[PDB]
């Protein structure tokens, strides 16, 4: 079932990979943590409603590029937090509706204790999300790939 993003450019039914540009907080002191609100960014909807109850999962969520050495925490799926990068398949959620339901995922990142200057570069790669599609009619499993880029510079204030 086809998804979308804030830019409106995403992948069609069956799978694929896309790029999603998100805006972050320029400064977050160690402690107070910035919510990567993908919930306002990514959206998806059951293209085939009624008799086929859609099942959508976050199989793989990995953090590399900038975040692997920078702002990096857990991942909140429908309230339930899980360690990030995703070491296991998350508990399932369902959509089964003709409405671009918000992706109930937020990246509760956390700056490292050894953070320095501009830890996240504008345009650097922060996180990647893999989406699992299962339904109630066939054994078709499709992966949907999102590549999050922060178009902005995140630097934690640093003192001594």
């Amino acid at each position: 079932f086809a998804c979308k993003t804030a830019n409106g450019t995403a992948i069609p039914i069956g799978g694929g990979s896309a790029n999603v540009y998100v805006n972050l907080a320029p400064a977050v002191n160690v402690g107070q943590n910035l919510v990567v609100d993908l919930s306002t960014q990514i959206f998806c909807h059951n293209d085939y409603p009624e008799t086929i109850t859609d099942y959508v999962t976050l199989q793989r969520g990995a953090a590399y590029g900038g975040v692997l050495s920078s702002f990096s925490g857990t991942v909140k799926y429908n309230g339930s937090s899980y360690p990030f990068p995703t070491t296991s398949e998350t508990p399932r959620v369902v959509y089964n509706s003709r409405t671009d339901k918000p992706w109930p995922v937020a990246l509760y990142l956390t700056p490292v204790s050894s953070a320095g200057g501009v830890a996240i570069k504008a345009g650097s790669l922060i996180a990647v999300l893999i989406l699992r599609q299962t339904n109630n009619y066939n054994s078709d499993d499709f992966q949907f790939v999102w590549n999050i880029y922060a178009n902005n510079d995140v630097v934690v204030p640093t003192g001594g």
């Epitope: 320029p26 002191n29 570069k121 178009n151 204030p157 003192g159």
Partner: antibody, heavy 119, light 108 residues
């Protein structure tokens, strides 16, 4: 109401510094980042740096990487801009400003000092 | 070159639409450059927080619009008052770089 204050004319010989203040009140402070801006007469207002009254953590850009010692006293909610080195050329108006946590931008600027270098 | 602006001075008769352009070295991140005014010997008052985003306490005639590589500001109507020098600040990379700015006078 919910604003910020700072001292007046701080005319001085080139010396070590001016070490001016930036007094804040009204809003729930020591929870919002604050930055600083230098305006040298009718020139660019090129931003200097930023200090965090939650933790200080202050850092500045490579241009004014030599004359900035921004800190804050939390109890009175008063930042301090201290020039590590003398200006002796940069007779510029210095502005305290703060950064809102929503749409991130500089808002509620300080009144501003007037730094003058003559002997 | 991380930011630049042109020209150094507009002008505006009352009731005249004014446009100012701020061009940047590379396409930035879309919708995050801020526009401030500074009157002479006065504290700067922010007007724009990213594209098409009025700041805290702006009129509606004042506005903005643009794209990811060259942004701009539009003041639809003029009543003097706002005669100040306006600067584009990029919330893209560190060091943040205020532009050259345009000392905007009033045209007669």
């Amino acid at each position: 109401e919910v604003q910020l204050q700072q001292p007046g004319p701080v005319l001085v010989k080139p010396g070590p510094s001016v070490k001016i203040s930036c007094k804040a009140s009204g809003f729930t402070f020591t929870d919002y980042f604050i930055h600083w801006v230098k305006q040298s007469h009718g020139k660019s207002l090129e931003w200097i740096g930023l200090v965090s009254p939650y933790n200080g953590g202050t850092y500045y850009n490579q241009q004014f990487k030599g004359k900035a010692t921004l800190t804050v006293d939390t109890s009175s909610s008063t930042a301090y801009m201290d020039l590590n080195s003398l200006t002796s050329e940069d007779s510029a108006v210095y502005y305290c400003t703060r950064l809102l946590r929503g749409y991130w931008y500089f808002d509620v600027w300080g009144t501003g000092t007037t730094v003058t270098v003559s002997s | 070159i991380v930011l630049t602006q042109s020209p150094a001075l507009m002008a505006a008769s009352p009731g005249e639409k004014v446009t100012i352009t701020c061009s940047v070295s590379s396409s930035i991140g879309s919708s995050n450059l801020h526009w401030y005014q500074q009157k002479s010997e006065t504290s700067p008052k922010p007007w724009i927080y990213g594209t098409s985003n009025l700041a805290s306490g702006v009129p509606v005639r004042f506005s903005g619009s643009g794209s990811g590589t060259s942004y701009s500001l539009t003041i639809s109507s003029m009543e003097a008052e706002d005669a100040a020098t306006y600067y584009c600040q990029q919330w893209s990379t560190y060091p943040y770089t205020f532009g050259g700015g345009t000392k905007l006078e009033i045209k007669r």
